[PDB]
Amino acid sequence: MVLYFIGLGLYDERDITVKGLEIAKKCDYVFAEFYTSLMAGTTLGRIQKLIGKEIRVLSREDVELNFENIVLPLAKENDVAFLTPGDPLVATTHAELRIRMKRAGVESYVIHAPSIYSAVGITGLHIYKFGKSATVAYPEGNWFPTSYYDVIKENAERGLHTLLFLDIKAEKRMYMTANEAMELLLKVEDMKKGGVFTDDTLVVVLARAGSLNPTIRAGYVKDLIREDFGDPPHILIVPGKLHIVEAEYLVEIAGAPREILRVNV
Amino acid sequence: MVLYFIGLGLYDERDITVKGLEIAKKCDYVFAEFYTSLMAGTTLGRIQKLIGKEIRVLSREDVELNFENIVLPLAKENDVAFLTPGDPLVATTHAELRIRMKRAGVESYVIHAPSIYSAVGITGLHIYKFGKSATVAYPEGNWFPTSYYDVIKENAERGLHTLLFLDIKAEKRMYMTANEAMELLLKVEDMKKGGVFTDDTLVVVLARAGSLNPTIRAGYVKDLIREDFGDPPHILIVPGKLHIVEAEYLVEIAGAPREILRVNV
Numbered sequence: 001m002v003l004y005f006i007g008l009g010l011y012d013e014r015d016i017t018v019k020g021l022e023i024a025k026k027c028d029y030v031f032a033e034f035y036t037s038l039m040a041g042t043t044l045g046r047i048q049k050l051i052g053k054e055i056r057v058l059s060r061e062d063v064e065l066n067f068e069n070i071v072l073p074l075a076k077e078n079d080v081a082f083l084t085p086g087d088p089l090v091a092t093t094h095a096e097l098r099i100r101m102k103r104a105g106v107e108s109y110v111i112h113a114p115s116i117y118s119a120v121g122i123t124g125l126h127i128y129k130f131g132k133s134a135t136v137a138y139p140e141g142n143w144f145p146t147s148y149y150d151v152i153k154e155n156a157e158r159g160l161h162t163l164l165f166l167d168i169k170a171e172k173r174m175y176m177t178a179n180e181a182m183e184l185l186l187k188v189e190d191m192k193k194g195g196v197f198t199d200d201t202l203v204v205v206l207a208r209a210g211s212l213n214p215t216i217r218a219g220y221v222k223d224l225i226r227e228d229f230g231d232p233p234h235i236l237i238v239p240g241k242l243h244i245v246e247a248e249y250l251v252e253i254a255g256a257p258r259e260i261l262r263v264n265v
Numbered sequence: 266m267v268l269y270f271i272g273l274g275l276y277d278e279r280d281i282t283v284k285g286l287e288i289a290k291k292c293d294y295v296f297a298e299f300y301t302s303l304m305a306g307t308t309l310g311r312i313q314k315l316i317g318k319e320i321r322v323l324s325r326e327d328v329e330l331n332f333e334n335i336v337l338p339l340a341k342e343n344d345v346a347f348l349t350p351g352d353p354l355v356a357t358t359h360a361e362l363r364i365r366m367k368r369a370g371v372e373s374y375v376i377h378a379p380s381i382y383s384a385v386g387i388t389g390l391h392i393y394k395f396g397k398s399a400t401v402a403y404p405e406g407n408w409f410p411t412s413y414y415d416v417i418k419e420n421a422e423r424g425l426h427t428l429l430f431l432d433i434k435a436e437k438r439m440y441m442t443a444n445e446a447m448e449l450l451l452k453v454e455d456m457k458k459g460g461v462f463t464d465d466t467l468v469v470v471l472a473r474a475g476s477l478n479p480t481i482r483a484g485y486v487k488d489l490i491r492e493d494f495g496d497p498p499h500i501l502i503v504p505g506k507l508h509i510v511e512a513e514y515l516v517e518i519a520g521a522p523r524e525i526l527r528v529n530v
């Protein structure tokens with residue numbers, strides 16, 4: 001009868017909510033996708049064991065082109081679950097999926113889970129101060145995306161922080177590191193020369209949020225661009241004018257240079 | 266003392282994550298606070314029953330002024346859990362708390378949970394398009410705050426959505442409804458004449474996020490300002506120019522007027 005959008009959380013299979021687990025356990029069919037993000041702390045096997053169901057993993061093409069062709073033949077007889085990393089509707093196009101299903105006569109429910117979008121709070125940066133978000137995409141051939149640079153510019157001018165989701169090619173097992181995003185940004189700066197992202201820009205890196213020991217680091221690009229932040233996933237943040245308490249957190253928790261406390265300079 | 270910040274999630278006692286529940290059960294002492302927000306879909310008794318541990322509630326004062334005298338000296342040699350609605354560290358007081366503990370030589374870990382910041386994704390509005398967020402506070406005495414109005418203007422001006430939290434008196438359990446928020450915003454519009462919030466402005470109201478049956482409504486102020494959105498807490502969002510996909514989602518899921526497909530896209 002119905003379709004469940006169930007988020008699995010940030011890091012591992014335990015990041016799912018109790019609500020999500022109890023509902024997943026009782027679904028007749030369980031589908032999942034693992035291309036919108038990376039859950040570096042678990043495996044398909046562990047998730048299957050926790051839920052006690054066999055999980056059919058879908059590729060991006062299966063979902064975007066054949067979702068209703070794969071699910072309709074079931075959702076019309078049985079309860080179906082669709083599992084995704086983090087929160088199913090955050091920084092994905094899965095919301096549009098609910099539209100398809102509804103037009104096809106299948107009602108759906110969403111079960112939220114920890115998302116990187118709110119997890120940024122662990123960096124000490126005021127979540128309300130974040131502005132428009134962007135994604136740093138891998139260049140492809142001659143195509144070199146650069147719009148994320150303009151987003152940073154617009155937010156920074158307003159004194160707002162910029163959350164930069166990093167690119168991922170799940171089928172090639174390529175997960176963009178914060179180091180790589182910084183290299184790409186330095187190159188876009190070299191081209192545009194807007195003084196938006198340079199060696200002296202203060203950035204914040206959050207790696208593997210959701211794990212008990214995520215990597216939280218802050219400092220100037222020149223010092224962090226070659227630093228090892230551990231395995232992916234990574235998220236990069238370009239803060240705006242800092243609040244003193246934001247600077248305190250970055251210094252005391254993220255090991256930032258004590259000089260940022262002079263938010264005046 | 267190792268301190269575990271554990272988020273309780275959006276609505277009820279099942280919104281905590283499997284990870285949070287298990288860690289909370291392993292902790293010798295479990296504290297909680299419900300002053301930053303309330304868990305409107307459940308009760309302390311129900312959360313206590315699920316966690317299977319005695320839950321010691323702490324007031325805003327207990328936390329901000331005496332946390333080191335209550336939690337620490339109690340949990341000399343043990344692990345302590347501190348339960349908070351939503352996702353820990355989203356609220357500023359939690360981040361400050363972590364800094365304080367670190368200075369006191371106390372290490373802490375964070376177990377994330379769904380936050381309203383990511384949950385709003387259920388409105389169909391793309392998360393990347395949200396800009397600076399703000400809170401609508403009641404005017405009182407000789408004080409009439411209006412900054413939240415400027416936040417809307419700056420965001421919408423750039424085609425960004427504005428997430429608006431509504432005033433809450435946790436201790437007294439009093440909430441500002443979306444209706445009241447709308448009246449206040451119109452009152453501010455009359456004072457500023459910015460053409461930012463009027464009877465023709467498109468807004469979205471979200472209530473009981475986390476619940477399996479949340480209330481998601483979209484429409485013009487003139488139509489929504491007297492609608493019954495149910496029990497608080499409510500969340501008000503003033504979107505910017507809509508993506509056609511966003512608009513279709515609002516029409517088909519949040520019952521928005523077909524009219525938005527040509528007026529707000």
Ligand SMILES: Nc1ncnc2c1ncn2[C@@H]1O[C@H](CSCC[C@H](N)C(=O)O)[C@@H](O)[C@H]1O
Pocket residue numbers: 010011036037038085086087088089090091092114115116117164165166167168206207208209210233234235236383
């Ligand atoms: N646990 C994590 N730690 C650090 N970054 C993460 C992360 N999870 C996701 N990200 C970031 O977000 C990108 C995927 S976008 C999908 C986000 C997911 N829907 C959610 O709600 O969390 C990743 O490439 C990475 O840039």
Ligand code: NA
Pocket residue numbers: 127128130131382395396397398
């Ligand atoms: Na935001």
Ligand SMILES: [Pt+2]
Pocket residue numbers: 092093096391510
């Ligand atoms: Pt989208």
Ligand SMILES: [Pt+2]
Pocket residue numbers: 302350351352355380381382
């Ligand atoms: Pt919250």
